[PDB]
Amino acid sequence: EAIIRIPPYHYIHVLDQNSNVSRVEVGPKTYIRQDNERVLFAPVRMV
Amino acid sequence: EAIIRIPPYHYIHVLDQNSNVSRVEVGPKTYIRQDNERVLFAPVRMV
DSSP states (O other), X not given: OOBOOOOTTOEEEEEOTTTXXXXXXXXXXXXXXXXXXXXXXXXXXXX | OOBOOOOTTOXXXXXXXXXXXXXXXXXXXXXXXXXXXXXXXXXXXXX
């Protein structure tokens, strides 16, 4: 799904394959993905 | 599709069914739709 969808103190790495500048998107928000913010992993808690 | 996708001098009516404030989204842009900007019609040219 083009919509990435984050719990509150969660964050995911977006693979900007225009630059592969993988950057943490500190949540939470309804971040929207073009294929320039490609998500890598899951909403796993990361205690 | 959640992504609405507009040619240059085109525009579509987004049905904000939180308010049904149908407003013209004068293009062009990769406008993204929550179900608060519900698209109504097609990318037909509208001469």
